[PDB]
Amino acid sequence: LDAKASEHAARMTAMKNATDNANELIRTLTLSYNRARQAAITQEITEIVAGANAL
Amino acid sequence: QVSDVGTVIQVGDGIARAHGLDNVMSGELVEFANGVMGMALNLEENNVGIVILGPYTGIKEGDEVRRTGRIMEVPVGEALIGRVVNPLGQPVDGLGPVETTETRPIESPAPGVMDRRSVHEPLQTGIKAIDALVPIGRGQRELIIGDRQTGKTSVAIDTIINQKDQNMISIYVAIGQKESTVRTVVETLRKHGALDYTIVVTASASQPAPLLFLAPYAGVAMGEYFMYKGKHVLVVYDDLSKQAAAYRELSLLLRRPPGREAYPGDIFYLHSRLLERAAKLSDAKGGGSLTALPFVETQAGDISAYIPTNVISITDGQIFLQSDLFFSGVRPAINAGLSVSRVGGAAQIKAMKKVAGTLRLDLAAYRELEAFAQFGSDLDKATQAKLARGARTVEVLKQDLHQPIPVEKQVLIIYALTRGFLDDIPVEDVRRFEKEFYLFLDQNGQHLLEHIRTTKDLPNEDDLNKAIEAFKKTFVVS
Amino acid sequence: PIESPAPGVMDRRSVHEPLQTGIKAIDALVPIGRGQRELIIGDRQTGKTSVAIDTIINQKDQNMISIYVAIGQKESTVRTVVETLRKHGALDYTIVVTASASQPAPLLFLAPYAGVAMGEYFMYKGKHVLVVYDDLSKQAAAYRELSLLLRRPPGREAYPGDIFYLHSRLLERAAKLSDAKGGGSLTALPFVETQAGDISAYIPTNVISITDGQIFLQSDLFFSGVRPAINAGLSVSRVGGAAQIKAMKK
Amino acid sequence: MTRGRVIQVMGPVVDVKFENGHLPAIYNALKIQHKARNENEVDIDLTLEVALHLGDDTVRTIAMASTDGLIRGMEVIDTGAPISVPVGEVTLGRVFNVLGEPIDLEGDIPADARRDPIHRPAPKFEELATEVEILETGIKVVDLLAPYIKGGKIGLFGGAGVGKTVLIQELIHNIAQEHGGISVFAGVGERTREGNDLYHEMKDSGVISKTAMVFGQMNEPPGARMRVALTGLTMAEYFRDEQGQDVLLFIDNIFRFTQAGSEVSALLGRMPSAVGYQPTLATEMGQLQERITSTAKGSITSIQAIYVPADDYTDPAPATTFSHLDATTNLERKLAEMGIYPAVDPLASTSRALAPEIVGEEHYQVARKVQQTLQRYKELQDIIAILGMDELSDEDKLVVHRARRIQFFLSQNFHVAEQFTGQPGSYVPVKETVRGFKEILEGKYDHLPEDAFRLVGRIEEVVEKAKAMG
Amino acid sequence: GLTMAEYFRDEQGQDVLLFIDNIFRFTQAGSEVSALLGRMPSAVGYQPTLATEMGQLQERITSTAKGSITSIQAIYVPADDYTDPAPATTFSHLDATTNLERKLAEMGIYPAVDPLASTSR
Amino acid sequence: GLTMAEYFRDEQGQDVLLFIDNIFRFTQAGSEVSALLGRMPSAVGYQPTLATEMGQLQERITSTAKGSITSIQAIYVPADDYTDPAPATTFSHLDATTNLERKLAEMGIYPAVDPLASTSRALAPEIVGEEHYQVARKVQQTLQRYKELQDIIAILGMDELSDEDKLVVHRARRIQFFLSQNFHVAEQFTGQPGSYVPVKETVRGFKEILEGKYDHLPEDAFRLVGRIEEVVEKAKAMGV
Numbered sequence A: 001l002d003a004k005a006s007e008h009a010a011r012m013t014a015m016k017n018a019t020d021n022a023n024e025l026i027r028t029l030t031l032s033y034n035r036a037r038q039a040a041i042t043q044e045i046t047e048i049v050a051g052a053n054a055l
Numbered sequence B: 001q002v003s004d005v006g007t008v009i010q011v012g013d014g015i016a017r018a019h020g021l022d023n024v025m026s027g028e029l030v031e032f033a034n035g036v037m038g039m040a041l042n043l044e045e046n047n048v049g050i051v052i053l054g055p056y057t058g059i060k061e062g063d064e065v066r067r068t069g070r071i072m073e074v075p076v077g078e079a080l081i082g083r084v085v086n087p088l089g090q091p092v093d094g095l096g097p098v099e100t101t102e103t104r105p106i107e108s109p110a111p112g113v114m115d116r117r118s119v120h121e122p123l124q125t126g127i128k129a130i131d132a133l134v135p136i137g138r139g140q141r142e143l144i145i146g147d148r149q150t151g152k153t154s155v156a157i158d159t160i161i162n163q164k165d166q167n168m169i170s171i172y173v174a175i176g177q178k179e180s181t182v183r184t185v186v187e188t189l190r191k192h193g194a195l196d197y198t199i200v201v202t203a204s205a206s207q208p209a210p211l212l213f214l215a216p217y218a219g220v221a222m223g224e225y226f227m228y229k230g231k232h233v234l235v236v237y238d239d240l241s242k243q244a245a246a247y248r249e250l251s252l253l254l255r256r257p258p259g260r261e262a263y264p265g266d267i268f269y270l271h272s273r274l275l276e277r278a279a280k281l282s283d284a285k286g287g288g289s290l291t292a293l294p295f296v297e298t299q300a301g302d303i304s305a306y307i308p309t310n311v312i313s314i315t316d317g318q319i320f321l322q323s324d325l326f327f328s329g330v331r332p333a334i335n336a337g338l339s340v341s342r343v344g345g346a347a348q349i350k351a352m353k354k355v356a357g358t359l360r361l362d363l364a365a366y367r368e369l370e371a372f373a374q375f376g377s378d379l380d381k382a383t384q385a386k387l388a389r390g391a392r393t394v395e396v397l398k399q400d401l402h403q404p405i406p407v408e409k410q411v412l413i414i415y416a417l418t419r420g421f422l423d424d425i426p427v428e429d430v431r432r433f434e435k436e437f438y439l440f441l442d443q444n445g446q447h448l449l450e451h452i453r454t455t456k457d458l459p460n461e462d463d464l465n466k467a468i469e470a471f472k473k474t475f476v477v478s
Numbered sequence C: 001p002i003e004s005p006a007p008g009v010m011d012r013r014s015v016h017e018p019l020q021t022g023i024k025a026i027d028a029l030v031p032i033g034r035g036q037r038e039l040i041i042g043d044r045q046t047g048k049t050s051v052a053i054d055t056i057i058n059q060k061d062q063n064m065i066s067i068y069v070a071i072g073q074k075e076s077t078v079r080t081v082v083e084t085l086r087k088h089g090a091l092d093y094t095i096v097v098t099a100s101a102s103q104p105a106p107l108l109f110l111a112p113y114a115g116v117a118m119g120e121y122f123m124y125k126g127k128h129v130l131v132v133y134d135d136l137s138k139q140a141a142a143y144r145e146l147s148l149l150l151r152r153p154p155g156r157e158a159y160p161g162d163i164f165y166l167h168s169r170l171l172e173r174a175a176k177l178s179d180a181k182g183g184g185s186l187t188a189l190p191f192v193e194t195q196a197g198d199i200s201a202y203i204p205t206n207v208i209s210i211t212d213g214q215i216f217l218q219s220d221l222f223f224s225g226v227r228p229a230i231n232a233g234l235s236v237s238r239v240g241g242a243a244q245i246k247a248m249k250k
Numbered sequence D: 001m002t003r004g005r006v007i008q009v010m011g012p013v014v015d016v017k018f019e020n021g022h023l024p025a026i027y028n029a030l031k032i033q034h035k036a037r038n039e040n041e042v043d044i045d046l047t048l049e050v051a052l053h054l055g056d057d058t059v060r061t062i063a064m065a066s067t068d069g070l071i072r073g074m075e076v077i078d079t080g081a082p083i084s085v086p087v088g089e090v091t092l093g094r095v096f097n098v099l100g101e102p103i104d105l106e107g108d109i110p111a112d113a114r115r116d117p118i119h120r121p122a123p124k125f126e127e128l129a130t131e132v133e134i135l136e137t138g139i140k141v142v143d144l145l146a147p148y149i150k151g152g153k154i155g156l157f158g159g160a161g162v163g164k165t166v167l168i169q170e171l172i173h174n175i176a177q178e179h180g181g182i183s184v185f186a187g188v189g190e191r192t193r194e195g196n197d198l199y200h201e202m203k204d205s206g207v208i209s210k211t212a213m214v215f216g217q218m219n220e221p222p223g224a225r226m227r228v229a230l231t232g233l234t235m236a237e238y239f240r241d242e243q244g245q246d247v248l249l250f251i252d253n254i255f256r257f258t259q260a261g262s263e264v265s266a267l268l269g270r271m272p273s274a275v276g277y278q279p280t281l282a283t284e285m286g287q288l289q290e291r292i293t294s295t296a297k298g299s300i301t302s303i304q305a306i307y308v309p310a311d312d313y314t315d316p317a318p319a320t321t322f323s324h325l326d327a328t329t330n331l332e333r334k335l336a337e338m339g340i341y342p343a344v345d346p347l348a349s350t351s352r353a354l355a356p357e358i359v360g361e362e363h364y365q366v367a368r369k370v371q372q373t374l375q376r377y378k379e380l381q382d383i384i385a386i387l388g389m390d391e392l393s394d395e396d397k398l399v400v401h402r403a404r405r406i407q408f409f410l411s412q413n414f415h416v417a418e419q420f421t422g423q424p425g426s427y428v429p430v431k432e433t434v435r436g437f438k439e440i441l442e443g444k445y446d447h448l449p450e451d452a453f454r455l456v457g458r459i460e461e462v463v464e465k466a467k468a469m470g
Numbered sequence E: 001g002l003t004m005a006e007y008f009r010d011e012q013g014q015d016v017l018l019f020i021d022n023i024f025r026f027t028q029a030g031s032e033v034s035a036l037l038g039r040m041p042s043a044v045g046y047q048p049t050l051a052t053e054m055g056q057l058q059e060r061i062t063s064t065a066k067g068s069i070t071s072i073q074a075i076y077v078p079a080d081d082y083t084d085p086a087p088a089t090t091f092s093h094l095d096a097t098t099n100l101e102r103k104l105a106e107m108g109i110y111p112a113v114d115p116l117a118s119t120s121r
Numbered sequence F: 001g002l003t004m005a006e007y008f009r010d011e012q013g014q015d016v017l018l019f020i021d022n023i024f025r026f027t028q029a030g031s032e033v034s035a036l037l038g039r040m041p042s043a044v045g046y047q048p049t050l051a052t053e054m055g056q057l058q059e060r061i062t063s064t065a066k067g068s069i070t071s072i073q074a075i076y077v078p079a080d081d082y083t084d085p086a087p088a089t090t091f092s093h094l095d096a097t098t099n100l101e102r103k104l105a106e107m108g109i110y111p112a113v114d115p116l117a118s119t120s121r122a123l124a125p126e127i128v129g130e131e132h133y134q135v136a137r138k139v140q141q142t143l144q145r146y147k148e149l150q151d152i153i154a155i156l157g158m159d160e161l162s163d164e165d166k167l168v169v170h171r172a173r174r175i176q177f178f179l180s181q182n183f184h185v186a187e188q189f190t191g192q193p194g195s196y197v198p199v200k201e202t203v204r205g206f207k208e209i210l211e212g213k214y215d216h217l218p219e220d221a222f223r224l225v226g227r228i229e230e231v232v233e234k235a236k237a238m239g240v
C-alpha cells in the first residue's frame, strides 16, 4: 500500500513537470511564430509600396 | 464665372475630380447635378478632389458641381429624438422630414485639459456583472470587446433600455450591420419604450465607404449639442473595426501608401479623434457629460490584434466577452479576470462597493479552481467554499435577455450571496430563489428599498438579515 | 580620394604577423593577424566598445597607428572614450573620427570611408594601421535613409539593392601589402549590433560574408558572470594558426 | 515682400507660393490670419511650418491645426524665424500648447517677453562635460541599484496603478529641494483626462509651482504631436543654458513622437521604411535625444516612458529609442500589492552607471551583494513552496532573515505620499543608504523585528522605530 | 442570378430560394478585376472594395412584405484558415453557419456537419 | 571563365574542371543594376528576368558529345533563407546538391552537410549497388527518426522513451558524429593532419555502426576521424 501511494505521488509530480515543460515550449514556439509572420507581412507591404512607386 | 461652379473631369470608385470651384473651402460640402452630396477633400493646383457621399453610378464626366458654402455639418436638436437617420441627417424611416433648426460641424475640437472634471457619477447599465465588477461612470469611455455572437449588441441594448428613468439621452450608431438587423433593434427599442430618448444613426453595408467612415463622427456631433447644453449623453459605436475597414478602403482608393499590417498609418489618429471627444465637463463649462461604448470584434479572442490594441490604448477600460463562456450557457459571458474599468470604481455607490470586493474574491477563486472539479476533495480548501460559493456566484451572475434590474435589487441579491444566505439552496434553484426574492422585496421591503435609493448605502444589517430570513422561511426547495 | 580602388590579387601577401589584443578569449581561439578584418558582433551593452578600446590600448609599445571611427554614437559617449584614451596614453598615436546621431545621414554614410582613406596614407607609406568602425549597422541605416529619400526601390528589409556593395567596397580595401608594395597593412574591426542575438539577419549575414571571421558576444553569457561572453560555436577566425606565435598555435 | 499665397491644400499639407528671391527658410513659421469676407467663409488663424522647397518659388508646409476653411489664394505672411516660445520664470507654474500659447485661465504672456527658437543644433563636442557624474535623487533603491546620470536618459516601465506619477512627483520635489533645480513635463500624445488629473495632482502636492507643462495631446494634429517634445525641450534648455541649473524633463510617451513623425512623413509622400516608419526615424530620434546632455555649466536629465508595440522589443521604434537609454526602472505590481513603496523591482531595474569606476568600489560591492542575496531568496521561495521553511539549512534561514529585512528597508516614505499616509517624507543620502545596507548585510541589526524596516528613512530611524515599538 | 430571383418576390409575392455555388470564387474574381484595374491591394492582396461588394451582393437578399428570398451559400476555406478575408467578411451577413469536417468525412459520417461548431440565431 | 571552358571543351575535346566560387553574386549584381534600367521590381526585390538570365548562363555549362565538363558551384543563401528566389530557382539546374547548415556548424560537426536535404541523382540501386543504397537509406531513416524525437524528448525526458527509441537515439548520435571528418585544408585551423577515406571504407564503417558493433564506445570518439578504425584508437587513447 505504501509503495502504491509512492507510485501515485511520483506519477503526480512527473506529469506536473511534463505539463510545465510543454507549456514553456508552447510559449517559446508561439513567440517565434508571431515574430516570424510579421516579417512576411512587412515584406508584402514593402512589395506593394515598390510596385506603386515604379508606376 | 467658374468660381462657384465646376465640371467633373474624372469619376471612379466613388471618387471624383472637378475643374473649377475657385472659392471652395477645404472640407466643404458640394452639390452635384442630380442632388448627390460630396466633400471637397483635396484642393489641388488646378482641380478639386471630391468624395461622393452616395450613389456615384448616376454621375458622368462633364456634369456640373454646385458649391454650398458650408463646412460639412449635420442637423442637431431635440427634434431628432425618436427617429432613425443617416449620417448626413436625412431620415430613413419615412414619417416625414425632421424639422430641426440648428446644425453643428462634424469636425470639432475636443474639450480642453482645463475644461474637464474627474468622473464621479455612476452609470447604471442594469447588468449585474457590469455594475459589480467593472463600474462605469458618466464621461468614461469604456471598450466592449469580444468575438462574434458574444452578446455585445445585447449588452448595449440592455444598457440603453435601463436608462428609462435616468435623465440620460442615448445615441445608437450602427456601422456596417444588416439593415434588417438595424430594423429589429429599432423594433425592440420601440417595444420597450426606449425611443422616447434615443437617436439611431444607421449606415448599412451597402452604403458607400465615406458614409461608414463618417457615421460615428455624426453621432458625436449630435451628442455634443446636448453635452454642451448641460445634459448627459450616451453614445454606442457598434463596429470600429468596420469603420477602420471603410477608412482603409477610402485611403487605398486615394492611393495613399499602406502602413503597418495594411492599415493606414493614421488609423490610430482616426480612433483617437473620435474617442477623445467624450468627457465630463467642469462646472465652468456646465454639468454636461458624454460617455462612449465603442465595439471591437476579435478573431478567436485574439486581444493582441492591432485594432484591439489601439482601442485599448485609447479607452479607459475594457469588457471582454468569451465565446467559450457564451457557449457553456453563461450568456453574460463577461470575463471578470480580464475585464477592468480604471476610471470607474470611484463613481460606484457605497452600498454596491461594500459587496463588490467579496464578490470579486469569490468569483476569482472559483475561476482558478474550476479545473480541479474532476475530483472534489481537500475539504474546505476546495469543496465547501471555493466550489460551492463560486458556482452560486456564477448562477446569480446570469441574466435574461432585455431584463435590466434596479441597482438596489442587485445590491440586495449580491449581499445575500456574499453573506452565505445561499449556502443551503441548491444550484438549480438559485435563479428561482432570486426571482421570488425580487417579488418578496417589492411586496414587503419598501422601507429597505427607499433607504438604499435615498442614501446610496446599505440599510441596518439586523433588519436586512431578518428580512432575508423571513423570505427564506417561505421559500420551498424544488 | 574617398573612392579609391582596393589592392589587387598580386598586391597582397598572406597574413603572418600576430596582433596581440591582450585578451585570452581572443588570442587563444579567435586569433587576429595584421591585415585581417574581424568584426565584433553582439547585442547592445555587451562589451564590444570595451574590447575595441582594450585592443587599441594594448598597442602602446608597438609602432602602429590606430583610428577610431564613431558612427551614430552619442557625443557624451565619444567624449568619455576620448577621455579614457587620454588617460591610458593612446592619444599619442590615435585619430578619432566622429559623426554623432544628430548629424545628417550623408555624414554618417561618409565617415567610415574618411577613416579608411586616412589609414591608406600610413598603409602605403609602409606603416601598420588599425581601424575601428563602430556601427556598420548605423551606416547601413543612414544609407537606407538616403536611398529611400532618393526614391530607389527597396529590397529585403527595405534596404537598397547595393547594401552589400556598400560594405564590401569599404571592407575590401583593408589588406596586407606585399614586399613590392612596401609591406604595409591595415587591420579593420567593424561592428554589427544584432537584435535579440539573431545572427541570421540580413545585415549581420552580409557583413559576415565579407570579413575574415567574427567574434560573437552573447548577452545571455554577458549576464550571469561570464563577462567576455565569447560564443565559441558562432565565433571563427579564418586566418587561424598563421596569426599566432608557434607556442600558442601548438 | 515676405508675403505669399496658398495654391494647394491637402489635409495637413499646405503649399504656399512666394515671390522670386524671397522664399522662407526651412523650419520657418508662417501665419495665416483671415476674416470672412462674406457668408461663405470662416475666420482662420493658423500657423504653418516650412518643410520642403518644391521649386518654382513654391514651399510645402505642414499645419499645426486643422486646415478646414482654407481657400486657394489666401495671403500668407512669413515670420522670418522658426517657432518661438516664451522662456524664463514666467513659464513656471503655467500650462502651454505646442505654439507656446497658455492653455490655463491665468492670462496670456506679454509680447515683450523673451522667446527662443524651437529648432536648434545640438551642443558642440567642446561644451560637453568630460566627467560622468551621479544625480543624487534621494531615493534609496534608485541611488543604490539603478543610479541616475546627469545628462542621461532613463526609461520608465510599469503597469497601471503602481505609482509612476507619485514617483515622478517625488523626484521633482527632491530635485527642486536639494539640488535647487526645476522640472518640465511634456505629455506627448496621451489622454487629456490623464493630463488634467496630473495637473490637479501637482496642484494638490504643491509641485506645480516649480514646473512647466506642455501637452499637445492625442486630439492634436501630427505636427503638434511631433513638436510638443521640442518646445518642452527648449523650455528645459533655457534654464541650464542661462542659469546653469540641473533640470528634469519628463516625456509621457516617446513612441507617440515617432508615430507622429511617421504620419507626417506619409503625408509628405516619402517612401515608407521597413515597417512603414519614416526613413528619417533614427535621424529625428537623434536630433531629439542629442540635445538632452550635460555640459560644463548645467545638465538636463530625462525620464521617458516608452510604449512597446505588441511587446516586441525588436520593433524599429523601441530599438532606436533603447540605443539612447542609460538606465531603466521597472514598477512592480506584486511589490505594490505587498506594500513596498516605491515598488521598483530591484532585480529587474538596470543602470549603466553601476560600475566601480563611476559609483565606487564599496558602492558596487554592496549593490552586487544585495542583488545576489535577493536572487538567492527568490530561488529559495520555490523550495519553500515545496518543502516548507524548516527543511532549509541554517544558512538558508539566515539568508531569508537578511533578505526580508533588506527588501523591507528598500521602502521609503515619500514627501508627496504624506497626503494619504500622514507620515512626512525623508531624503536619504547615497552614502547614508550604502552604509545602512552594509550594516544590514553585516548582521548588526538582525535582532530587530522585521516590521521595523517596513517604511523608514535612514538606518537610525529603524532602531528608533524599534525602540518606540518595544 | 440574384436579379433573376428578385422578380418572383417583387412581381408575384413568392418565397424563393437562391443557391450560390461558392462565394470564395466571387471574392477571387473581384480581387482579380481590381488588380486588372490597377488599384492598390488590400490586406492579403484582395480588393479594397471587398466589404462594399459583399454588402452590395448580400443586402439585396432580404424579406419584404410581398415575399422573401432565403439563400444557402457555400464558402470555401483555404488551408483551414478561417481568418482569411473571404471567409471572414461574409460572417457578418449570415444568420446560421454550418461547418463541415474532413475528419468526420473520412469516418463515414455524412453530411459530416460539426455538431459543436454549427451555430444559428 | 565559361567562354574559356567552352573552348577547352569543344576545340580540343578535353575533360574540364570548372570551379565557380560564388554564382549568387551574378544574380545579385543583376538585381542591383536592374533598378537603374527602368525595370519594375519583382518578388522580394529581384529583377523580372531572374529566371531567363540565370538559365542563359547555366545552360551553357553542360557536357556534350565532344567533351565533358564537370562543374562545382558554390551558391550563397542570403539570410539563411532557402526559400529566397535566387537559391530556389537554381535548384533545378543541378544534378547533385549538398546543403550546409549553421546549426550543424555551431555543433562543431564539420563539414556540416545536412544529411537529409542533400540529394543526388546517382543514388540509385543500379548505380551505387544495393549494399550502398540500403545503408544510405537506413542512415537517412534513423536520422529522420532522431530529428522527430526531439520534441517528445524535450517535453517528456529521455527515460520516457521506449527501448527501441532509446537505441535509435544511441545509434543516431554516433552516426551524426561519425559523419564529421578532418580535412587536409583544415590543418591550418586545427593541428590534425586530415585523412582520405575510400567509399568502400565509408560504407563498411556505417554498416558496422548500424549493426551495433560500436555501441560501447563513447559518443565523442566518433568526431573528426577518418576510417572506422581511428574511432577505436581514439577510444583506446581516451581509455575506453
Ligand SMILES: Nc1ncnc2c1ncn2[C@@H]1O[C@H](COP(=O)(O)OP(=O)(O)OP(=O)(O)O)[C@@H](O)[C@H]1O
Binding pocket: B146, B147, B148, B149, B150, B151, B152, B153, B154, B155, B331, B332, B399, B400, B401, E121
Ligand atoms: N443574456 C442573454 N440571454 C439570452 N440570450 C442572449 C443573451 N445575450 C445574448 N443572447 C442571444 O445570443 C445571440 C447573440 O447575439 P448578439 O447580437 O447579442 O451578439 P453580438 O456579439 O453583438 O454579435 P453579432 O456579431 O452577431 O452582432 C442572440 O441570439 C441573442 O439574442
Ligand SMILES: Nc1ncnc2c1ncn2[C@@H]1O[C@H](COP(=O)(O)OP(=O)(O)OP(=O)(O)O)[C@@H](O)[C@H]1O
Binding pocket: C043, C044, C045, C046, C047, C048, C049, C050, C051, C227, C228, D352, D355
Ligand atoms: N571585461 C569586462 N569586465 C567588466 N565589465 C565589463 C567588461 N567588458 C565590458 N564591461 C562593462 O560592460 C558595460 C558595457 O560595455 P560596452 O560599453 O563596451 O558595451 P557595448 O556593447 O559597446 O555598448 P553600447 O551598445 O551601449 O555601446 C560597461 O559598463 C563596461 O564597463
Ligand SMILES: Nc1ncnc2c1ncn2[C@@H]1O[C@H](COP(=O)(O)OP(=O)(O)OP(=O)(O)O)[C@@H](O)[C@H]1O
Binding pocket: B342, D158, D159, D160, D161, D162, D163, D164, D165, D166, D167, D341, D342, D414, D417, D421
Ligand atoms: N509612495 C507611495 N506610498 C503609498 N501609496 C502609494 C505610493 N505611490 C503610490 N501609491 C498608491 O498607489 C496608487 C497609484 O498611484 P498613481 O496614480 O501615481 O499610479 P500610476 O502607476 O501612475 O497609475 P496609472 O498608470 O493608472 O495612471 C496611489 O493612488 C496610492 O494609493
Ligand SMILES: [Mg+2]
Binding pocket: B152, B153, B238
Ligand atoms: Mg451586433
Ligand SMILES: [Mg+2]
Binding pocket: C048, C049
Ligand atoms: Mg558601444
Ligand SMILES: [Mg+2]
Binding pocket: D164, D165
Ligand atoms: Mg500615472
